[PDB]
Amino acid sequence: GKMEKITCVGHTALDYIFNVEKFPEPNTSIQIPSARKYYGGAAANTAVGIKKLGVNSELLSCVGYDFKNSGYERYLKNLDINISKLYYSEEEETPKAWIFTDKDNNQITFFLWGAAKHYKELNPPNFNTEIVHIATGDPEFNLKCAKKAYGNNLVSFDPGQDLPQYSKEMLLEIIEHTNFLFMNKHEFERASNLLNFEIDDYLERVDALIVTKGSKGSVIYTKDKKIEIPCIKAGKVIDPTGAGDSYRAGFLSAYVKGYDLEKCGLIGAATASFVVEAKGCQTNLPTWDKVVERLEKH
């Protein structure tokens, strides 16, 4: 691991938002004009944010036969994100979330696993990047990645919504091969209960535990110190989703650019502040200069 470059491993996924009046009762149908498409998936959100910040990124994801000359493939190619490590299924569609949201803002999500079925027949390559960041995807494959990369590339891990799938054993084992561990508060609360861990137990295993708290900021724990990172004010909150992935993008981009962990947290906080300003996880990702400028005022 040597090049100014981060590998993101895990979901590259299409999200489709369906705004409805009311969800259908049994034996009924609803009709809607259209669904809005968004480029998502935790790994691809992070990879695209890293690239936007001027750090080369590569993606390792299982995509499907619709990926494939369509919108998502060309959009990534256009941003110069390395997608040479993608696995292309002939049998299944690209993972995607179909998100149906009513007028009172209640939501029902159908996630298509689809091409992600292929991870269990795959094994990770040697990585040549400074950091291998492991996001939602297939936990067994993600553990293979962490075990292969650790002690060679820096490992970043953010189990996210996959958390419930990890056994205590398996979660322990991946954390033992992790350098940066990121979790939101609910995730951290969940994992700690599983593992019977307190903060000090994590720090016996990882170099930095980062717990994000949305609008209340974040905190970085190291063997040495606790670093409190403020929330950075957005222009106006539209879609609070994608704040997660983009904080990770900022943090890891800053780390590869050679800044200390405090400033990495600050850049993370400032990156996320741009992302909440629009619908979609990738639609308002900032440049490095814009991040540094926003941080400069607050």
Residue 85 DSSP class: T
The residues, any chain, with a CB within 8 Å of residue 271's CB and separated by 6 or more, are: 49, 53, 246, 247, 249, 250, 253, 285, 286, 291
- Partner that binds at residue 41, options Mg ion, ligand ADN, ligand ANP, none, CB closer than 5 to 8 Å by kind: ligand ADN
**Residue 164 burial (CB < 10 Å; 0-12/13-18/19+)?**
exposed
Asked if residue 162 binds ligand ADN (CB under 6 A), the reply is yes
Residue 144 DSSP class: H
Q: Which of 75, 88, 111, 288 binds its own copies (CB under 8 A)?
A: 111
Residue 297 among known ligand-binding residues: no
User: Least distance from C-beta 41 to ligand ADN, angstroms?
Assistant: 4
Task: Mark 163-202 with x for binding to its own copies (rule: CB under 8 A) and - for no binding.
Answer: -xx--------------------x----------------
User: Least distance from C-beta 186 to ligand ANP, angstroms?
Assistant: 7
- Tokens of residue 24, six digits: 């259908």
Asked if residue 241 binds ligand ADN (CB under 6 A), the reply is yes
User: Least distance from C-beta 88 to ligand ANP, angstroms?
Assistant: 27
Comparing CB distances to ligand ANP, the nearer of 109 and 123 is 109
The one-letter code for the residue type at 273 is: S
Between CA 116 and CA 34 the distance in angstroms is: 26
Report residue 61: phi and psi, to 5°.
-145, 155
**Taking a C-beta distance cutoff of 8 angstroms, is the pair 6, 252 a contact?**
yes
Asked if residue 29 binds its own copies (CB under 8 A), the reply is yes
Comparing CB distances to ligand ANP, the nearer of 6 and 17 is 17
Asked if residue 50 binds ligand ADN (CB under 6 A), the reply is no
CA–centroid distance for 130 within its chain: 17
**Residue 280 burial (CB < 10 Å; 0-12/13-18/19+)?**
buried
Comparing CB distances to ligand ANP, the nearer of 119 and 247 is 247
Asked if residue 109 binds ligand ADN (CB under 6 A), the reply is yes
Residue 118 DSSP class: G
Task: Mark 21-60 with x for binding to ligand ANP (rule: CB under 6 A) and - for no binding.
Answer: ----------------------------------------
Residues that bind Mg ion (CB under 5 A): 160, 244
Between CA 46 and CA 32 the distance in angstroms is: 31
**Taking a C-beta distance cutoff of 8 angstroms, is the pair 261, 223 a contact?**
no
Stretch 245-264 residues interacting with ligand ADN (CB under 6 A): 245
Asked if residue 230 binds its own copies (CB under 8 A), the reply is no
User: Which ranges of 158-260 does DSSP label H, i.e. alpha helix?
Assistant: 168-175, 185-195, 199-203, 243-256
**Taking a C-beta distance cutoff of 8 angstroms, is the pair 153, 171 a contact?**
no
- Tokens of residue 246, six digits: 């983009």
Task: Mark 30-49 with x for binding to its own copies (rule: CB under 8 A) and - for no binding.
Answer: xxxxxxx-------------
Could you list the residues that contact its own copies (CB under 8 A)? 18, 20, 23-36, 92-93, 98, 100, 102, 106-114, 117, 161-162, 164-165, 186
Annotated binding site for substrate: 15, 31, 41, 45, 109-111, 161, 245
Could you list the residues that contact ligand ANP (CB under 6 A)? 107, 184, 212-215, 217-218, 231-232, 234, 237, 240-244, 247, 269, 272-273, 276
